[PDB]
């Protein structure tokens, strides 16, 4: 069973794509394994963990409540919005919107939340504030998934994303309650079955968020570890491949499987 970097090289060869990967120790922040970690990749829905991080930061500051009801309109609806479209007539709470955005990649839910934090520019300012000088959101759903080659809009790097996730989930910056809530939404992810979850051994913890975009873009960010406790952050992104969704999912799962097989090697 190949070592992680061996598997990544096999995957790039088979897909004709580019893979970006970081494996980071959660406690210490040390980088354990890295590949194209300073290259940009479209975030797709993976940005939604940062989004809801910014929302919780406002909650912590008394500027937001998860129970606050947001009412919206037809104008606000975009593709891939299964939950927000259902609740159009009734509205949704901020917390319900974050749950939909994270667990089901609900696009309109994310756009509604984005408006509460100042739009893409506002979310980018939040990133800069927590010391991420690389990650950027430029557009709203659904354009942010366009993944045009060489386009820096709506991208992160595996290194920056891993550091930022660590900051959001474990640093002083969010309250204990907010960290638990962000992590819980990731634990409850519903659309990540074919990826790391498909190769996760019995008894391990996982919390994750996925993304899919045009031009082959696909990704996952995850916290996982043995004994039902998070130990490491794993970020895997794919861009620039014409391969099928099945093949892209299988390769990401395979890279995850390699990291797991070589966990202590």
């Amino acid at each position: 069973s190949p070592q992680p970097l061996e598997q990544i090289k096999l995957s790039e060869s088979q897909l004709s794509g580019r893979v970006g990967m970081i494996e980071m120790d959660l406690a210490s922040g040390r980088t354990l394994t890295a590949w194209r970690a300073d290259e940009r990749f479209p975030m797709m829905s993976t940005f939604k963990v940062v989004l809801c991080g910014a929302v919780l930061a406002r909650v912590d500051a008394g500027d937001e409540q998860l129970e606050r009801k947001i009412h919206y309109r037809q104008q606000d609806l975009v593709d891939y919005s299964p939950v927000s479209e259902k609740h159009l007539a009734d509205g949704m709470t901020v917390g319900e919107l974050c749950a939909a955005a994270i667990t089901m990649s609900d696009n309109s839910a994310a756009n509604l939340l984005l408006a509460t934090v100042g739009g893409p520019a506002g979310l980018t300012a939040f990133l800069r504030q927590i010391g991420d000088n690389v990650t950027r959101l430029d557009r709203w759903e659904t354009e942010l998934n366009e993944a045009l080659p060489g386009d820096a809009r709506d991208t992160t790097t595996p290194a920056s994303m891993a550091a930022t996730l660590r900051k959001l989930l474990t640093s002083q910056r969010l309250s204990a309650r907010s960290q638990r809530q962000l992590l819980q939404w990731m634990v409850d992810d519903r659309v990540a079955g074919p990826l790391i979850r498909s190769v996760l051994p019995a008894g391990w913890f996982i919390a994750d968020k996925t993304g899919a975009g045009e031009r082959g873009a696909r990704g996952i960010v995850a916290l996982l570890g043995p004994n039902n406790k998070a130990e490491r952050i794993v970020v895997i992104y794919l861009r620039d491949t014409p391969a099928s969704m099945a093949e892209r999912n299988q390769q990401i799962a395979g890279i995850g499987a390699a990291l797991i097989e070589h966990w202590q090697r």
């Binding site: 037809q74 104008q75 891939y80 609740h87 007539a89 749950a99 354009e143 045009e214």
Partner: protein, 165 residues
Amino acid sequence: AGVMTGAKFTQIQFGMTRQQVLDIAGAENCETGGSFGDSIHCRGHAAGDYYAYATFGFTSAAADAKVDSKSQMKLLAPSAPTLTLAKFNQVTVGMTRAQVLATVGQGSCTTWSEYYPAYPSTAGVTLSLSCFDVDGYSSTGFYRGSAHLWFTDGVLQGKRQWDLV
């Protein structure tokens, strides 16, 4: 059996009970409660970062409540997508459904959501159409030329497009 499909969506009708819906859809494909309140949400094939799906809304939480709302994503393809940015720009708020369709193309659209809030009356019926240019629709990926046209009582209230011509 299979997952949720366009054929199953079409066979499900306004006025049906929850059990009727579940019997056509295949109960293993469906869920209710949680994020979906007392509607029934049924998954089709994987698409993008989610699934093609249908969602059925009901007049109340009662066992005998009837379907008053049907929504779907990526269960149905447009007949002859001829929509263009030009035709989209000809569409105007206040237009009739007929006027709109004649404009964007009679085979350019599918029904995204249709809701009768006064069922069995049609008063206040809200309709969202998903319309597509020649290569705009995708059942498994991302649209590359589409528009959302929404109506109340059969009159256009607003419009929005992505990637047209």
